[PDB]
Structure formats: C-alpha cells, structure tokens
Ligand binder design. Sequence first.
Ligand SMILES: CCCCCCCCO[C@@H]1O[C@H](CO)[C@@H](O)[C@H](O)[C@H]1O
Ligand SMILES: CCCCCCCCO[C@@H]1O[C@H](CO)[C@@H](O)[C@H](O)[C@H]1O
Ligand SMILES: CCCCCCCCO[C@@H]1O[C@H](CO)[C@@H](O)[C@H](O)[C@H]1O
Ligand SMILES: CCCCCCCCO[C@@H]1O[C@H](CO)[C@@H](O)[C@H](O)[C@H]1O
Ligand SMILES: CCCCCCCCCCCCCCCC(=O)O
Ligand SMILES: CCCCCCCCCCCCCCCC(=O)O
Ligand SMILES: CCCCCCCCCCCCCCCC(=O)O
Ligand SMILES: CCCCCCCCCCCCCCCC(=O)O
Ligand SMILES: CCCCCCCCCCCCCCCC(=O)O
Ligand SMILES: CCCCCCCC
Ligand SMILES: CCCCCCCC
Ligand SMILES: CCCCCCCC
Ligand SMILES: CCCCCCCC
Ligand SMILES: CCCCCCCC
Ligand SMILES: CCCCCCCC
Ligand SMILES: CCCCCCCC
Ligand SMILES: CCCCCCCC
Ligand SMILES: CCCCCCCC
Ligand SMILES: CCCCCCCC
Lengths: 333, 333, 333, 333, 333
Amino acid sequence: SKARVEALANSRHVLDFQTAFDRPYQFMALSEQATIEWGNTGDANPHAEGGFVKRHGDDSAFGAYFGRRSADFSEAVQTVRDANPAFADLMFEQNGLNLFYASKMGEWTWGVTAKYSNGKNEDPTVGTKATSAGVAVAASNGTWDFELVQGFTGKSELDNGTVTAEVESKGLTNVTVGYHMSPEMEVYGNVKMSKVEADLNGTPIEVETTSYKVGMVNTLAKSEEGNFFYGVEVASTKVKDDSESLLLPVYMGVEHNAASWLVLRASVAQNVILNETKDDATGNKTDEDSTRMAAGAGIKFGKSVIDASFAGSTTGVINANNLFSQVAYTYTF
Amino acid sequence: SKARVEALANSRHVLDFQTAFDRPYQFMALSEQATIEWGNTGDANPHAEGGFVKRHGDDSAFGAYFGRRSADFSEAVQTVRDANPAFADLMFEQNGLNLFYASKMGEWTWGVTAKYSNGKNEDPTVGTKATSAGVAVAASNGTWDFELVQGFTGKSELDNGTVTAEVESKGLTNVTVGYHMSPEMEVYGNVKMSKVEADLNGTPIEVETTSYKVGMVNTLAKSEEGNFFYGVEVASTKVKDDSESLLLPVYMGVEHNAASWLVLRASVAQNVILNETKDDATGNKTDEDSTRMAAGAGIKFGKSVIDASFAGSTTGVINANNLFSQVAYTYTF
Amino acid sequence: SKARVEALANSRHVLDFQTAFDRPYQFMALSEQATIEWGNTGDANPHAEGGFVKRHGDDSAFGAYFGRRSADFSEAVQTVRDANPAFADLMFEQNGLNLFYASKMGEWTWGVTAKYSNGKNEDPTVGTKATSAGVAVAASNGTWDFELVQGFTGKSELDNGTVTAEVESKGLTNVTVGYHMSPEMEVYGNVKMSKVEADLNGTPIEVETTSYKVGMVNTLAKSEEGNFFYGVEVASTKVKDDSESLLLPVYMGVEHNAASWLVLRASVAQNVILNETKDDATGNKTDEDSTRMAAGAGIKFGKSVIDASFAGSTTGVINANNLFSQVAYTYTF
Amino acid sequence: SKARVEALANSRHVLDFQTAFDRPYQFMALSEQATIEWGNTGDANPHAEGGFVKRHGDDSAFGAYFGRRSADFSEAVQTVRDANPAFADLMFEQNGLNLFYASKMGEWTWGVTAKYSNGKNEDPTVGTKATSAGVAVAASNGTWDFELVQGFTGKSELDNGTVTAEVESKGLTNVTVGYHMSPEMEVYGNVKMSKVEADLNGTPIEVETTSYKVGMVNTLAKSEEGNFFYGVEVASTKVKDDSESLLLPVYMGVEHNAASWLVLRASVAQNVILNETKDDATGNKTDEDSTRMAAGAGIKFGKSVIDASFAGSTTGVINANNLFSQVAYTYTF
Amino acid sequence: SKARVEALANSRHVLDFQTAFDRPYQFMALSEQATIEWGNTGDANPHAEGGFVKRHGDDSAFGAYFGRRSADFSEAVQTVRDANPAFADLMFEQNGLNLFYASKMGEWTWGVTAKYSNGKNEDPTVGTKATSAGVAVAASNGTWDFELVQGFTGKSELDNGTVTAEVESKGLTNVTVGYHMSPEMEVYGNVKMSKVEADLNGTPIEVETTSYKVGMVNTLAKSEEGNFFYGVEVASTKVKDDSESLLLPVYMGVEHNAASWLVLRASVAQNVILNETKDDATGNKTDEDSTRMAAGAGIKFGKSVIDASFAGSTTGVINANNLFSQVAYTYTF
Ligand SMILES: CCCCCCCCO[C@@H]1O[C@H](CO)[C@@H](O)[C@H](O)[C@H]1O
Ligand SMILES: CCCCCCCCO[C@@H]1O[C@H](CO)[C@@H](O)[C@H](O)[C@H]1O
Ligand SMILES: CCCCCCCCO[C@@H]1O[C@H](CO)[C@@H](O)[C@H](O)[C@H]1O
Ligand SMILES: CCCCCCCCO[C@@H]1O[C@H](CO)[C@@H](O)[C@H](O)[C@H]1O
Ligand SMILES: CCCCCCCCCCCCCCCC(=O)O
Ligand SMILES: CCCCCCCCCCCCCCCC(=O)O
Ligand SMILES: CCCCCCCCCCCCCCCC(=O)O
Ligand SMILES: CCCCCCCCCCCCCCCC(=O)O
Ligand SMILES: CCCCCCCCCCCCCCCC(=O)O
Ligand SMILES: CCCCCCCC
Ligand SMILES: CCCCCCCC
Ligand SMILES: CCCCCCCC
Ligand SMILES: CCCCCCCC
Ligand SMILES: CCCCCCCC
Ligand SMILES: CCCCCCCC
Ligand SMILES: CCCCCCCC
Ligand SMILES: CCCCCCCC
Ligand SMILES: CCCCCCCC
Ligand SMILES: CCCCCCCC
C-alpha cells in the first residue's frame, strides 16, 4: 500500500505491490493478492485505485491495476492549473490502466509493466484531452537489479474557445542498477531524465531535469518480528537554467509486527551536510531545514490487512479526529 | 443490507434481503430474518426502512417491507425538483409497501414481489399526490435465472396556487436472464426500457431510455473464509434524441470473515476500453475517469449483525467523525 | 429506561420502570432497582430524572421518583410558548414528584401512582405559576389488564407587566383494558379524552381531543436470548372543530442479548393503508410518509446497566460524535 | 478526586482525599496515596492541584497539598469581578498550600488542616494583592463527629491607578456535629456563619450569611460490590436583608465496582416540599425546578485510578467529544 | 521521549534519550534503541526529530540524532521575531545534527555530545543565515555526576534589503554537580551563565543571565511497578539590569507500569514560600499562582512504545479531540 511504502521512506529494501510497478520482477516475489487504495473518482486525493497479482504456474505472475496516475504527469498538469485559473479543466490521466507480467527462468527473474491512460471531454466549453503510455522492464537475480522505466506518451491539452493550454512530455527515462552484497546490504545507482514542454495560451515553457543518485540501504539480520533499516543517498538534480541541488539524505526506520493485529511503521530522514540548492542565475543558495518523519500502521485480520498513515503524524497527535488516513485494503489469498 | 450490497459492487453473485426484491426466488434462500435500515421519516437520505422474511412451509417464504423507494421514481422526482425551487414539494413515494412470496415446487423456485405506495397533501399551498405500483416475478433452478420487473404506475403531481408540475412513468420493463455453468460462474443478459413524461408548469418533457447489458461474474471455489469475486459487463444505453453510452465496467471485490465479530467488504471498479458517452446532436464524446471503490463492514454478535459503510472511504480516512454510515441492523432468527 | 422503551417502539409487551407509572401493577413485577435519567435541571431536554422501586414483604412494592413531566402538560405548554416569543417563560411542571405502591392480593395485582408538581417565580418581570396533580390506578391477573390514568389538576399561568397567558386542563382521562390469550399474545383497547382551555393575552382557546385505539401485540416463544415482537393498532383521533385522523400503525422490533455486555434494540413502524388526517374545516386530507425506526443499546456490567439511543439512528450513522444519546443508568439490586 | 465526590452528591458518607480537608480525622482512614487534579495554572477551571497523604506510625498520618482554593473566597472574588469589567484582575488565592496531620489516640481520632495562600502583582497597572489563611480541627470516635472550620484571613484587593476594589472576610466559622447510630445511619447538624465586606471603587458592601442544616444519610449493609446510599437534609439560609431560603434536598446514589477496570458512580437529587427562596425586600418567592443528577467513572489499573465526570451527563450523551471531564489521577501506594 | 521527560517533571532521576544529550554518560546506560519525535519540517512545533544509540563493545556506546533545537537559541530567535513583523524570517537552527559517544572506564562512565547546525536562504528578499555549535562533556561513577554544557557558536541574522536583525551568543556555560548518597537520594547544584547580544535594525540589545540552583530529588525503594519521586529546588536567577527571581519549586510524580500495554505518568509542582520576581528598576515584585501538573502515557507493544502527553491535561478532559499529543515512537532492539 501507499501508506506502508511512505511510512517506510520509499526505501529500496521494501517489497510491496506499490513498488513493483517500477520493479516488475517484484510481482513474482509478492504473494497472490488483491489491493484497493481508498479514495474517490475524478480529481481527488486520494484517488480510488486497485488491482491484483496472480500466480500463473510455478514460474510466472501477472495482473492488472486500475486508476494509477504518474507522479510526473500529475505534477505537470497541476503546475499548469496553478499558473492560471482559466486552465482549471486541464486533465489528469483518465482511467489509468496497468498490465504486468513477471517470470523466473532459472536464476533470473524478469518482469514488465505497461501503463496506458486516455480520455477526453469534447464539450466545447471544456474541450480537453489526455493520453499517457509507458513501460517498465526489469530483471534481477538476487545480486543484480536492472530496472528501466521509459515513458512513451504524455500529453494533456485544453481548448475551450477562450484560452488554450497544453503540456507534453519530450522524453522520460529512469534507469536503476542495484548490487546486493548480502541479504542485508544493497547499493544502487539511478539516473533520471525528463523533458516537459508546455504552451499556456500562447506562452511556451520548457522544463528539463536530470538527476543522479547513488545510495545504500542496510537491514538487520532478519528478525521474525522487526525489519529495521537505514540508508544514505547522494542526489544531484539539475533543472536546466533553473537550479541545481546536491543532497545527502540520511534515513532510518522500522516495520515491527507489534501485535497479532498490529504492524507499526515509522521512519525519519534529514539531509546531512549536503543540503544546498543553487540558483543557476544568481548562484544564491537555499540551505534550509529538511528534517522529516513518517508514521503508519497495519491492522491485521489474517488474510485481511487495513494499512494507513497516522493522520496526525505531522502535528504529533493521535486523537479520534486525527487517526488513520491514506487507507488501503489488501487481501492476501 | 444496502451497505453490504453496495460494498460488494452490486454483483449478481450476492444473496441479500436487498437483492431479493427484484429476484424474489432469492426470498426462499434467505434465512428467516428481520432487517431495519437506519434513517429518518420523509425526505431523508437514508430513509427509514424495514421488513422481515419468514418460512411458511418447508418450500415457501413470504414477508413484508416498509419504506422502500424506487430508484427510478426518486431520480425523476429529484430531477424535476432541481429544475426549479417552485417544485421542491414534488413527492417521493410515500409509505412504500412491499409484499413478497416465494415457493420451491420442483427443482424450480419462483417468487413474486408486489410494491405499492400512495400519499397526498391537499393543503392548497402544497397540493401534491404521488402513487406507485409494480411487480417483480422470477424463477430459477440453479442453472437458469428468469427475472422480470414491471412498473404498473408511477406518478407524482404538484398543483398549488402558483405553479404546477407532474412526472409520470409511461412504462418500465426490466428483464434479466442468467445462466450458471457452475457455482463459480454466471453469465447474464439484461434489457431495460423505460419512458417518462413530465410537465414543468406547462413545458412538457419526455425521456425514453433503453439499455442492453451482457456480463459475467465469477467467484472462487467456495471457502468458509474469503469470497473473492470479479465481473465484466458491457452496457449500451440509448436516451432517445439525447445521448448514447457504451461502457465496459470491470470490477472485483471481497467479502471476508476477518474475525468472529468482523466482516470486511471492499471492491473496486473501472470502465476499461469502453467509456464513451456520445451526445446525439453534436456527436461530441465524453470520456472521463470511472475508477471507483467501496468499503464496508459487518459487526457480528451471533444472531445480530450491524452493517455499515466506511464513511471515510471516498477520502481515504478512518477516524471518529468518519467511521460508519449507511448503518443497518439485521436479526437472523 | 426511556431509551429502552423508545427503542422497543413503546410496545405494550415491555416491562420497564418507565412503563410502570401508567400501569402501576408493573411495579410489583419489576426488580428492586434505582434508575437515573441523565439530563439537566430546568428547561432541558433531556431532563434530569430518577427514582427507585423497593419490595415490602413478598406481596407489596413501593417507591418514589423525581423529575417526571407529563407529556400532555409539556405539549400544551410548548404549544402556547410557540404561539409567541412573549409567552417564552410559560412553565413546565416544576419539581415533579411521583409516589407509587403495588400489591398482589391473590391472583390480582393492583397498584397506584400519585403525581404532584408545583412551582412559581414571582419576579415581576417573569411572574409564573404552575401546578399539576394526577393519579394512575391499575389491576391485572395476568390475563386481564385494567388501567385508569386520571388528571386532577394541570395549570400554568404567566403574568408580567406586559402580557398574560394561561393554559389549564379541564379534564384528562385515559382508560385501557388488555386481554392476554397467552404469554405470547395480547389485545387491548384504549379511550382517551382531554380538554384544555388557554388564554393567550386575551384570546381564549379550547382544544378537546378524544381518541379510541384497538390493537394487538405478539411475541415469539419466550426465549432466553432474542425477544422479537410485532403489533398492529388502529387509532381514531378527533380534535373538535379541527381535525380527524384514522391511522393503522404496524410495528416490529427486537431486544437481543448480543453479548455478556451488550443488549441491542431496534424497531420499525409504518402506517399501513390507514394514514389519513382530514381538516374538519376544509375536508382537506394529509397522507404523508410515516416510516420510522429506532435503535438503542444497553451496556451491561452485572447490576449496573447504561441504556442509550444510537444518537445517529436518524442519519444512518455510528461515529464518535454520534454514539450514545438519551443515556440512563439503572442499578438493579 | 473532585469528580468522585461530586458524582456521590457530596454525601457525608464518602471518604475521599477531597472530603478530608475539612474533616481531618479522615486523613487517618485514607490509604497512603498521591493524587493530582488535572488542570491549568492561574484563573483556570479546573485548576491544577495535587498532594499526598502518608502514614507516620501505626497511629498517625500527615501530608501536604498544592493548589486548593476556597469556594467562599472564589465566590467573593468572582462576584466582584462580575460587578464591573474594571475589577477583572482581582486575584483568587495564589499558590494555595495545605498542611494536614491526623492522629488516633485510643478510640478517638483527631486531625487538623492548615490552609495558607499569598500573592501580589506590584505592576502599577495591575496592583493586586491577596492572602488567605484558615484552619480545620476535627475529631471522631466512630459514633461522634466534631468538625470545626475557621477562617483567619480572607482578603483580595486591587489598586491599578484607575479603580480600586477589595473584598475581605470578617469571620468564617462552620461547625458540624454528626451521630452514627450504626455503620449504615448518620444524622448530622451544621451551622455556618460568614460575614464579608467589600469596596467597589468607593461603594461599600456587606454580606452576612447564616445557615442551619440538619440531615441524615443512609447506606446499605457493607457489600464489596455496590455501595448504595440516600439522604435528606433541611437547610435554612438567611442572607441578612437580602434573601432567605428553606430547602429540603433529597438524594440517592450508587458507587458500583462494575468491572475489574471500572467504577461507576451516579446520583440524583431534588428539593421535595421545601424549595423556596424569598427576596427579603419584596417578599417575592422563587420556587423553580431543582431536579439534578451526576455521573462519573473510575478507570482502575490496580494502584492507578483515573477518575472523571461523564462530561455529557447534563445532555444525556456519551460520545467521543463528551467522554471524560474533571479528570484526576490517584496512585495508592 | 519528550512527553515522558515532561510528564516526569523533567526530574534529574529520569534516564531517557532526551536527558542524555546534556548528560552523555547516560548514553551508556540506555538500551540500544531508535526514537522518533513526531512532527513537521521547518518552523513547526512539534518539530520532526529522531535518532539512535548503539553499543560498541561492552564499555562504549555511540549514536546520532537529527532535528534537535536548542531552547536558548529558539528563545532568542523567537523574541527577536516578536519584536517586529519585519523579522518574521529570522531563522531557528537548521538541520540540527548531534553526535554522541560514551565509555565506561572502570567505575567511571564518561560521555560527550556534539551539537552542530547550519542553514541559509540567500534569496535577496529573505537573506538569512544561522549557525550553532556546542558540546556537553560529563562523567559519573554512580556517586558523583559532573556535567559541563558549553556553547561555542550561536548566531542567526537577517538582511533583506529593507531591515536587518541579528542575534548572537557571546557565551553559554552550564555546570552541574550531583551527589548520590544512595540509589534513592540525589542532591545537586547547577550554575548557568549566558550573554546574548542582538541588533534590531540599528537598535542594539544585550541580555546577560546568571542562575544558581541547589536541589534534591528522591525516589522510593525500587518497585518493579511504580516509580514514585519528589524533589525540592531553590533557584536564583538574575538578568543584569532587568530582573531577579528566587523560586522554591517543590514537585512530585509517579511513573507506573499500569498494564502490560500501559505506562501512566503524572506529576505536579508548585513554588512553595519562595516565588518572587523583582523588577530591577522599580523594585516591584510579582508573586502569582504557580501550580502546574503534567500527565502522559506510554502504549507498550514489546519492543515498540508510543509515548504521548494527555492533550487534555490542562483542561481536565480525556475525549476524542483531546487524547494524545507530543507523540513519539521508540523501538528498543
Ligand atoms: C555533531 C557534529 C557534526 C558536525 C558536522 C560538520 C560538517 C559541516 O557541514 C555543514 O553541514 C551543513 C548542513 O546543511 C551545511 O549547511 C554546511 O554548508 C556544511 O558546511
Ligand atoms: C497498459 C494496457 C494497455 C491497454 C491499451 C488499450 C488501448 C485503448 O485503450 C482504451 O482506449 C479508449 C479510447 O478512448 C479509452 O477511453 C479507454 O479508457 C482505454 O482503455
Ligand atoms: C402490495 C400492497 C398493496 C396493498 C395496498 C392497497 C391500498 C393501500 O392504500 C394505501 O396504503 C398506503 C401505504 O402504501 C397509504 O399511505 C394510503 O393512505 C392508502 O391509500
Ligand atoms: C406525589 C404527591 C405527594 C404530594 C406532595 C406534597 C405536597 C406539597 O407540595 C409542595 O408545595 C410547595 C410550595 O408550597 C412546593 O415548593 C413543593 O415543591 C411541593 O412539594
Ligand atoms: C503531461 C506531461 C507530463 C509528463 C508525463 C510523463 C509520462 C507519463 C506516463 C508514465 C508511463 C511509464 C510508467 C511505467 C509503469 C508505472 O509506473 O505505472
Ligand atoms: C414519478 C415516476 C417516475 C418513474 C418511476 C417508475 C417506477 C414506479 C413503479 C414501481 C416499481 C416497483 C417494482 C417492484 C419491485 C421493487 O420493489 O423493486
Ligand atoms: C398545561 C395543562 C395541560 C394538561 C396536562 C394534564 C396534567 C395532568 C398531570 C397528571 C397525570 C399523570 C399522573 C399519573 C402518573 C404519571 O404518569 O406520572
Ligand atoms: C477574599 C474575600 C473574602 C471571601 C471569603 C474568604 C473565606 C476565608 C478564606 C480563608 C481560608 C479558610 C479555609 C480553611 C479550611 C481548610 O483547611 O480547607
Ligand atoms: C541566535 C541566538 C543565540 C542562542 C545561543 C545559545 C545556543 C548556542 C549553543 C548551541 C547549543 C549547544 C548544546 C550542546 C548539547 C545539546 O543540548 O545538544
Ligand atoms: C495484544 C494487545 C493487548 C492490548 C493493547 C491495547 C492498546 C490500546
Ligand atoms: C481481533 C483481535 C483484536 C483486533 C482489534 C482491532 C481494533 C483496531
Ligand atoms: C485482542 C487484544 C486486544 C485488542 C485491543 C484493540 C484496541 C483498539
Ligand atoms: C464480544 C467480542 C468483541 C466484539 C467487539 C465489537 C466492537 C466493535
Ligand atoms: C475481542 C476483540 C474485540 C476488539 C474490539 C475492536 C474495537 C473497534
Ligand atoms: C469484556 C468487558 C466488558 C466490555 C465493556 C465495553 C463497554 C464500551
Ligand atoms: C470482547 C471484549 C469486549 C469488547 C468491547 C468492544 C467495545 C469497543
Ligand atoms: C488490561 C486493562 C483492562 C481494560 C482497560 C480499558 C480502559 C478503557
Ligand atoms: C476485559 C478486558 C477489558 C475490556 C475493556 C473495554 C474498554 C472499552
Ligand atoms: C488487552 C487488554 C485490554 C485492552 C483494552 C484497550 C482499551 C483501549
């Protein structure tokens, strides 16, 4: 679930339905299961999602998933929307669909995820259309992880007889390699590039981001009760003619099976030493407080698990108005 | 209960007091029971409802229910009311009454549900009259379902000193055939034709709707624990000289006995590939997000069960203000 | 408790401290107990109340009770108060007092309940005075029930230097006879007449109401777990030179011992076929939706029991701002 | 705790840290304990309080307590504060301190409580000073209770350079004698005389109240489950040249050990027959509804007990916004 | 955790991750653990914090901690911020880092805590820079405690082209000596000295504070369940040419293992006899109510512990809006 992965800091050691989309060999290690992210239709946060992963014989898995929206796509569209209130109708991805398949052939597991979305409102006063398509291919043997995420299409446009807007992807590539020395240690490198082009009612805009990350994650000698982990990552991010950040996030956390009905999840992070963002023009530096934490739970009823975030975590409260948020339901067959 | 059927995506595999009305042979399969939908008198959502089903012989069942309102009826009345604040007194069905009977004679079980409602307010500053009457007849032998739902009468009129308005069913027919190749699989076909004439203070309105549906719902090999299910339905709807939609809803869900006191219910759906509503005049297409989900619980105290929806399901939360809504109570003798 | 009798639809099969006032032989059948209705002093809904019933020998019972207000009295007083904001201080009964006694001679149990109240505020800007006095006499042998409720005095008057109002009872009789063919069935009939004169700042008013009720109540074989009941009653009410009503309420409900700590209560009722009120002046008829339900609970700690209503029953909701209302506390010795 | 004594209607039969201050022989009967009344610093209701009682030999006890304020002192200061917003800074007792000591010398237990308070704000725009001092001496032998409570100093004054105010005790004496015919019955009498003077920016005021109470309280035979009790008291109060009241409070209640973790407490009272207050000037009588109840719990964890009032009692609700108020914590060593 | 230390009156008898920073030998006595203080990034209260302590051989411990902010530093910044809204951006410490180490050398355990922080916003409209560095050195043999906390750097400054502001530490020294006659008694003394200089847009300011404290703290002979404690301390504080105070805080509390899943924490305090603050200029004295209390809880799931304050402690309530605040999560390996 999203709440689980978030409380676990999105760390690379985590195995989850939600991390498998972009690491599809993981679909082969997951238990057959159905999961539903609670939320609403349309422009809603959380947005309703859900799907399943099934085993097909001994050496492969497959499944489908409804409603998943790309982080990059939704960010771009929201930036346009926030630019001018006339762009309020610019679409997020409509009816997102994922298909995925994984197979273990001897010592290597490989997998593939396909992403497609498409929709339109041809009402003249709205006049919107959006499409996306992409793929993730990956393989692993326990020691080596190879992950490739490639966007094919990402476009959203608006034209209502008053204004016009559009935003489009001119390339999305995410490549990751991981090396696991032992079941407790992993090191990883990652390179990401996206090009986005927008036209807001005449005015063109471009954004090009390139980011390099090198990191390591450690876990403890496997406990039957507590997965404790810690990590360090160096992250270099260049927005063309905008800015450049060099960040050293240090993080740590735990997933603890605290009771027959309860999993507790918590983690904390801070950028240690390296926290600067520099302006390409002025060279002025922003270097501000970055300490952050996360907390959530799982309520276990055997095959049924209700995951959530502690809604009060950012304010330090557990109280009946601030209990669970980002709820998901997972049934493991 | 309503909340249970809704958390299970209204799938045809469900057997429930609330699914029995329009599939009256089901009344012969339910355990003798009394059920009450929490709510209020009058123009309230939820509206108070309640009834029972009792075994007559070893091969028949019968009972009565109070307060059921037709969905078609309430939609028509509410559309009219939304037309203009002058029509805010247009009545919904008053004092709904249902009687139903079911008998297993051979390998064929058959059943009948009669619905009637009638009310009026003759205060001159109000002056309103509403009536409805309908039947449902059905039979099944486990392999084949035949269900017919017939509207005989539906009329609501408003005549005060200032404005008039009326709305009236000119025919409501609903026919379903189902085939069960096994206990796990059903295919079903459904045809629905309805015509509605209304008068909004002189101006006349006419809406005619025909829909064709073909679908399949599968359940896993029956276990004492977790009823998982998925279905595919293709649905053509034609509103005369108005619009045409062709939708392919896909859904899955689970009913799990999570604890001796706890039933958990969840489901997710999306229109896959086919999601278009075309406007008749312009030919403009609407193709927008369809993802939706549902979550509910049953709290179990032996013969008493309290059913509910997770009120926070559309916003992803569970907390003191968003725990249980659409509550119902059922006593199984 | 009030919430218990309300959740059990006020049915005549109920034995409760709260149904005994107007059926005083019941005080012989109750267990020695002290009950308290949570509320406030003064013009508060709910109003603080409470009393006890104690055994004297094996053949008599007696007790006293504080705070009880007559339904008819408060209805009268509220009608006046609503007539105009200047009658806003017209009093309800002040410091209600009830005393009661019951004795079982041979096969007959008889009892009497005395009600008296009296209060005044002689502040010149308030200037109010209210008094009431009445009695209940009843006998029963298990098969026949004879109940007389007689009002002696009921007056409430207000005179500040600005306006005057007074309401006064000119007669209040209630006679009920019940017949029990078995412990599972009861038929009964009831005549009630009441006359009330009021003066609102000069305008005189008279209301005279006469009602006849014949009804039936059945329970299922006395069980040790679930007490299911249903009833039918036809009720004719005449308000002289105002209104006539003929109503056929049908109701049904359950009291279930759902756990060692929990009693669940629920009922639903509707006017079936007969639901008509006709203005005597115009002959205009009102015939509007009458479906209604009620839900409550008892939290059991051996000799302590906390009764309540599901505060969210009318909205279909159980959450943390809508849990228990109408709380009462009963200690059974 | 305050909530405990309050839920038991302040009955003379109760033994509690909070009743011992003015009945110091009780400090010898209490179990060594530490109690903390939850609250805030300053002009806060509830105000933080806390202290302890400790045994010395087998025949003596002593202890201290922080934060206690006199009801008469707070009544006086609040009345002045309410006379005029200019007097808003008039001080309640500051840093209240109690020392107490009890000893048993044969059949007689005796004890004394000393109360001191003192504080000032010499800021010229506040200019406040307040002081109090008093003693309680009492002795009991089981059959006979002698309690004397004597004020010594009671003064609060304000001089901010724009208005002056002061209020001052001219004598506070309160004498009680009780007789216990048995462990179940007590009759008691009480005389209280107080004289207060005040200056409200040059206007002088006096209040001499004198009161007589004779009462009786009964409990049932000692049972380790549910201590039931009732009482009646007649009380005559004369506020010299202002008002007179004659009041006959009748009350009953229960403390029930309802579970291993739960103590339930409830009581109801009403003035019966005698409920009159007469304004001395005009002779105008006020005689209004007096019914009132109270309810609380103890949550027990062996040596730890959290006491509270049911915050929803005056409105008859129990829900997660109206759960516990007037919380206190008590550790019995 | 902070809630734990606070509910325990911040007493010197408490051993906690939060009291070790300034008593680093304690890091040798703490069990290996990770802790997270729930909160947010940036100018937030509570502020996300967290870290760990780990053993390294049998005679040493080390670890690290993110997010901690000096109370003196935050006080200085906040006072400057309050002086003028033009200083709204004056930074608190950014990305606080703590490293600590401790070693048992025979009968002596010694430890060291290093604190460093640094951040900046070079946007010309913000123009802020902040830096801090400090050390704590301490050692103990179980009988003698020696603690030195020393501030090296402490500066925060703002220059946005419109206003300037800065605050700087010209010295921070904190020495404590403690003596333990037994495991139940401790006496201690403490001297603290600090000079802070500031410039608010050309207006200079200086604040030199010196304080002395001598205290005693006691616990009872160790139970396995209920740790009770009480202390007295006398504290003299002089702010050069501004103010002085002499205060005698007396206090008392308990940490009780109330259940396998619950720790209850409560204390209360008041300044007894000595409570005066003199204005150096006018010689005027302030001497106002000082009673205060604190209540918290630990929820225990074996190695996981969720600590909190009772959010409603200052108003005496436990309800669903006021349950737990200042939450922290601790995993003991
Ligand atoms: C417990 C002692 C830790 C000392 C760390 C000193 C490293 C200096 O690095 C600085 O880290 C901050 C963090 O953001 C940066 O802002 C500075 O530019 C660095 O020099
Ligand atoms: C990643 C799975 C690939 C599925 C691709 C299906 C191709 C077309 O998909 C549908 O196209 C229509 C056209 O509007 C959309 O409305 C549907 O939602 C799509 O599923
Ligand atoms: C399937 C049951 C049909 C039997 C009802 C026939 C006549 C009922 O008369 C009306 O009953 C309604 C309730 O639906 C009342 O509200 C009306 O007042 C009656 O006229
Ligand atoms: C339940 C019947 C018992 C009779 C009550 C005694 C009659 C006395 O009435 C009192 O009248 C005074 C005023 O004179 C009221 O203030 C009291 O509340 C009454 O009890
Ligand atoms: C509208 C322009 C914004 C940028 C859009 C980038 C392309 C988005 C499409 C994502 C496809 C790749 C995802 C692989 C599988 C998955 O993660 O679901
Ligand atoms: C105001 C009219 C609008 C159109 C509404 C037509 C529906 C009225 C007929 C009632 C249908 C009842 C079918 C019997 C079984 C059931 O209870 O569903
Ligand atoms: C304001 C005047 C309206 C008239 C109301 C009738 C007043 C009569 C009150 C006494 C009737 C109750 C006596 C029987 C015992 C009981 O029900 O407590
Ligand atoms: C402040 C203006 C006058 C108001 C009345 C003051 C009443 C006297 C206060 C002195 C304290 C008496 C309490 C001693 C009994 C005890 O030990 O609790
Ligand atoms: C800008 C305001 C100046 C405030 C001056 C006081 C802070 C300077 C010293 C930093 C704190 C060092 C604390 C060492 C041990 C610890 O508590 O972690
Ligand atoms: C198995 C857990 C025991 C009870 C824990 C309750 C936490 C609120
Ligand atoms: C069925 C074991 C206890 C479950 C408690 C869950 C409540 C959040
Ligand atoms: C089944 C052990 C106790 C569960 C406590 C649940 C508290 C929410
Ligand atoms: C009596 C077994 C536990 C039932 C718990 C229900 C609470 C929602
Ligand atoms: C016996 C387990 C019952 C737990 C109740 C859960 C409350 C929501
Ligand atoms: C199993 C002990 C009784 C539970 C009482 C709960 C009431 C809310
Ligand atoms: C199963 C023991 C009692 C559970 C009480 C549940 C009420 C929340
Ligand atoms: C193990 C503790 C018993 C239950 C305590 C419940 C308090 C609300
Ligand atoms: C029988 C164990 C305690 C039940 C506590 C329920 C509190 C709501
Ligand atoms: C598992 C023992 C009782 C738990 C009670 C929890 C109350 C919130």
